[PDB]
Amino acid sequence: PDKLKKVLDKLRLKRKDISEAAETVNKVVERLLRRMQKRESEFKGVEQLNTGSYYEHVKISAPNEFDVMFKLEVPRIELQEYYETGAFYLVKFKRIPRGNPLSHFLEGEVLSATKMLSKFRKIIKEEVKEIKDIDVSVEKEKPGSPAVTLLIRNPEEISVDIILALESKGSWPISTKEGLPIQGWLGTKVRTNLRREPFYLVPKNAKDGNSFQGETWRLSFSHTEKYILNNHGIEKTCCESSGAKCCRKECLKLMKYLLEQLKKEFQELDAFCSYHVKTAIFHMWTQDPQDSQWDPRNLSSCFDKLLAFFLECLRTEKLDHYFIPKFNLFSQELIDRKSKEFLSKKIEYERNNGFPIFDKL
Amino acid sequence: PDKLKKVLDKLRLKRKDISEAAETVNKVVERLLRRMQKRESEFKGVEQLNTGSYYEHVKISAPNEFDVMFKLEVPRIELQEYYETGAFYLVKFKRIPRGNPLSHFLEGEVLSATKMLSKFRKIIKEEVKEIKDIDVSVEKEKPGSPAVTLLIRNPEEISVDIILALESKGSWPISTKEGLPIQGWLGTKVRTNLRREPFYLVPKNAKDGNSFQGETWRLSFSHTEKYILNNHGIEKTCCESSGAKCCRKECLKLMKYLLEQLKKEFQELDAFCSYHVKTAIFHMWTQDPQDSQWDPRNLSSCFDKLLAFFLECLRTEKLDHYFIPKFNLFSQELIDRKSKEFLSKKIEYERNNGFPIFDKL
Numbered sequence: 126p127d128k129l130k131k132v133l134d135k136l137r138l139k140r141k142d143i144s145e146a147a148e149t150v151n152k153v154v155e156r157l158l159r160r161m162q163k164r165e166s167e168f169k170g171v172e173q174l175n176t177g178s179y180y181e182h183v184k185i186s187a188p189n190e191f192d193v194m195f196k197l198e199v200p201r202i203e204l205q206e207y208y209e210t211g212a213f214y215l216v217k218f219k220r221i222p223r224g225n226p227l228s229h230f231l232e233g234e235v236l237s238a239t240k241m242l243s244k245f246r247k248i249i250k251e252e253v254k255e256i257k258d259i260d261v262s263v264e265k266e267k268p269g270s271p272a273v274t275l276l277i278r279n280p281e282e283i284s285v286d287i288i289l290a291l292e293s294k295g296s297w298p299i300s301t302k303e304g305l306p307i308q309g310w311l312g313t314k315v316r317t318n319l320r321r322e323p324f325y326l327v328p329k330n331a332k333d334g335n336s337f338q339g340e341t342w343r344l345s346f347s348h349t350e351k352y353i354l355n356n357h358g359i360e361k362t363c364c365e366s367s368g369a370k371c372c373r374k375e376c377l378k379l380m381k382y383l384l385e386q387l388k389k390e391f392q393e394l395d396a397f398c399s400y401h402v403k404t405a406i407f408h409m410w411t412q413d414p415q416d417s418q419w420d421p422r423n424l425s426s427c428f429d430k431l432l433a434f435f436l437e438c439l440r441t442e443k444l445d446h447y448f449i450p451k452f453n454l455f456s457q458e459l460i461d462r463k464s465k466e467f468l469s470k471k472i473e474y475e476r477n478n479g480f481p482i483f484d485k486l
Numbered sequence: 487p488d489k490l491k492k493v494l495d496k497l498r499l500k501r502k503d504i505s506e507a508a509e510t511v512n513k514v515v516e517r518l519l520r521r522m523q524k525r526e527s528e529f530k531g532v533e534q535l536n537t538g539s540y541y542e543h544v545k546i547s548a549p550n551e552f553d554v555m556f557k558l559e560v561p562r563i564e565l566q567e568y569y570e571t572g573a574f575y576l577v578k579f580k581r582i583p584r585g586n587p588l589s590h591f592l593e594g595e596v597l598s599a600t601k602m603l604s605k606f607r608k609i610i611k612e613e614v615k616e617i618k619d620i621d622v623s624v625e626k627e628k629p630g631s632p633a634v635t636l637l638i639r640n641p642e643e644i645s646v647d648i649i650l651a652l653e654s655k656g657s658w659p660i661s662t663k664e665g666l667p668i669q670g671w672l673g674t675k676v677r678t679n680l681r682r683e684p685f686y687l688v689p690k691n692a693k694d695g696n697s698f699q700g701e702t703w704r705l706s707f708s709h710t711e712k713y714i715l716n717n718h719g720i721e722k723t724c725c726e727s728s729g730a731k732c733c734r735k736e737c738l739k740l741m742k743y744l745l746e747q748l749k750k751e752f753q754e755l756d757a758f759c760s761y762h763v764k765t766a767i768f769h770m771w772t773q774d775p776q777d778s779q780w781d782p783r784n785l786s787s788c789f790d791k792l793l794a795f796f797l798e799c800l801r802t803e804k805l806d807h808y809f810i811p812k813f814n815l816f817s818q819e820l821i822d823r824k825s826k827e828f829l830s831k832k833i834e835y836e837r838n839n840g841f842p843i844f845d846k847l
């Protein structure tokens with residue numbers, strides 16, 4: 126049936142909740158940024174990434190919250206690959222002048238992710254709670270998150286995550302060599318621009334290896350994904366004013382929503398997050414490049430194709446990173462087989478049954 | 487067929503095409519406002535009137551327009567009608583509170599828009615010249631137009647003009663009590679609340695004495711007008727998530743785009759502006775208050791019903807100001823018979839041959 130088309134529209138109805146929430150979050154981040162700049166700290170060269178506009182990105186995917194990245198460039202750097210992650214690395218320097226104060230954050234000859242993030246979080250908590258102009262608080266530092274999560278409850282509880290992000294203009298680490306496989310979908314010209322762009326390192330402590338290493342940083346391809354999320358067609362004009370519409374974002378928002386609503390009532394599903402669905406659909410679009418395969422008069426069949434890919438992913442325990450092939454996101458190290466089978470049941474049960482979890486008048 | 491549902495779809499997909507300039511103007515005005523209220527001028531106590539946001543499509547230009555109002559609260563104000571117009575006033579002050587900068591703008595006992603406006607422009611160019619150096623214009627000082635006109639100079643060229651408005655927390659003026667007929671549609675209770683919020687004054691020169699008397703202000707209800715736009719239904723669950731959709735704001739956007747198209751092609755239609763349609767749809771909603779009259783399935787009949795109403799307005803030369811019943815926007819002294827007749831022609835011929843002007847996919 127076309128029940129899905131009506132689910133989209135009940136979701137699409139974010140009037141005065143996504144556009145009026147932007148203006149304020151635009152402000153808080155634009156004010157916090159400018160007060161973080163020119164204020165005597167190592168982060169004076171901090172700048173907002175064009176990480177997906179409020180109303181372009183983070184609108185049809187995870188509405189309850191926002192995220193922004195605060196990038197900061199660094200000079201000549203050495204990446205040491207953390208064991209066999211492909212994603213986790215240790216960041217060192219090349220010379221270390223005193224015309225570069227990021228050094229105040231090295232524990233050893235490695236830039237520490239924790240000394241930087243704690244001082245970053247410090248300066249935010251201290252400059253954010255220094256004005257009584259809007260009701261904006263800082264949530265508890267949750268062990269594991271690389272973020273400073275802004276809690277605001279002016280109309281309702283909103284969450285803005287600030288991810289400090291090292292920017293590197295050098296060559297993309299070699300673990301991403303045969304990743305980003307868009308050559309039969311986005312073309313080789315497009316893939317080549319994308320890789321000339323910088324890459325980013327977020328302070329995500331690797332919970333494995335020696336112990337919870339906080340000095341470890343994780344790669345983050347956020348700028349690139351929004352590119353793929355916005356330029357998703359094999360035809361340049363896809364879902365543009367003078368071109369044809371597809372259901373790629375449709376399927377993704379439904380998958381996002383479906384997984385969102387199950388996670389809400391099954392803490393057994395805490396090990397799955399939206400990035401699993403995102404990387405899932407990236408492999409889907411790499412499989413079916415032609416925008417004919419994503420026609421809005423086959424939303425049902427397109428959505429079902431995705432459901433089946435994700436179930437085969439949860440069964441074969443295989444979820445290789447879109448950019449880092451060697452890093453399997455559904456490793457048994459990362460996710461117990463209990464939660465995969467548990468997820469498979471709920472996704473099966475909803476799918477066999479016209480998705481009763483979507484039933485809201 | 488129902489080709490207008492498709493024309494609405496092509497404006498939803500033209501709104502995102504401007505989300506950038508929209509955020510451009512948010513950063514430009516918020517930095518401008520902040521710069522205004524951190525310096526010694528008569529407008530240090532200025533605020534942005536929350537006249538909605540750039541999610542404005544129903545109410546004004548789908549392709550090129552951005553309005554903004556700066557509210558400056560004033561003391562006990564003594565409005566004296568400009569003879570009988572209802573809409574035009576002189577602003578008198580008998581008792582000026584010790585400490586009010588609104589003294590320098592006086593002429594005897596009557597506030598000068600002219601002298602205030604000409605200090606409103608100065609204080610701005612001394613802050614948009616030092617507001618770093620963006621690509622937003624600082625346009626021509628114009629006549630009549632109570633604004634410091636600007637426009638987008640980044641991408642294409644969207645327009646953005648800043649209207650100084652006095653805020654008065656007094657009683658709504660005597661000319662506007664028989665106004666706002668929203669008793670059998672929105673309620674007596676909400677009407678009472680809507681007339682207990684301030685009224686605004688924009689500095690609009692008039693057409694009397696000779697013409698352009700250099701001491702008058704016009705009434706402004708853009709705040710209340712916004713409220714009625716977003717609270718248009720008689721059922722409070724209107725257009726909400728847990729309620730039923732209507733086609734009200736849909737019809738408005740169709741009619742405003744129809745008129746802009748025609749306007750964009752004929753000099754003869756220069757007397758007509760977007761606020762003529764708004765007023766016409768406010769009466770249109772007072773006359774048909776039931777929400778089932780505006781079902782999204784009746785869209786063409788609703789749109790044609792409004793088209794027929796607007797024509798009965800043009801041709802009988804009656805379109806009362808919604809908050810000032812005595813001020814006839816389509817009066818004989820305001821729009822001549824030549825123009826109405828012209829307009830009644832291209833509309834009708836634009837209503838019987840389907841919608842040729844709406845033939846740009």
Ligand SMILES: Nc1nc2c(ncn2[C@@H]2O[C@H](COP(=O)(O)O)[C@@H](O)[C@H]2OP(=O)(O)OC[C@H]2O[C@@H](n3cnc4c(N)ncnc43)[C@H](O)[C@@H]2O)c(=O)[nH]1
Nearest residue numbers: 192267268269270271272286288329332397398399400401
């Ligand atoms: N805002 C944000 N938060 C991120 C994050 N990467 C991890 N986290 C959060 O930190 C905690 C540590 O968990 P772990 O077991 O992995 O050490 C967790 O609270 C984690 O939240 P979560 O993993 O369920 O994610 C919440 C939020 O972050 C997205 N996310 C998780 N993992 C990733 C990766 N590898 N790349 C890009 N985004 C990721 C989630 O989808 C969700 O939106 C981060 O980048 N940003």
Ligand SMILES: Nc1nc2c(ncn2[C@@H]2O[C@H](COP(=O)(O)O)[C@@H](O)[C@H]2OP(=O)(O)OC[C@H]2O[C@@H](n3cnc4c(N)ncnc43)[C@H](O)[C@@H]2O)c(=O)[nH]1
Nearest residue numbers: 546553629630631632633647649688690758759760761762
């Ligand atoms: N933003 C704005 N601009 C206004 C305005 N009142 C007048 N104007 C513009 O100033 C010039 C003087 O013309 P007039 O013949 O009235 O002396 C004109 O260029 C006038 O513009 P326009 O009237 O053709 O339309 C421009 C713009 O402003 C809206 N608007 C016109 N009239 C009103 C009234 N009475 N109330 C609320 N909005 C009005 C138009 O729809 C359009 O967007 C003003 O109040 N604000």
Ligand SMILES: [Zn+2]
Nearest residue numbers: 358363364371
């Ligand atoms: Zn598309």
Ligand SMILES: [Zn+2]
Nearest residue numbers: 719724725732
């Ligand atoms: Zn409605």
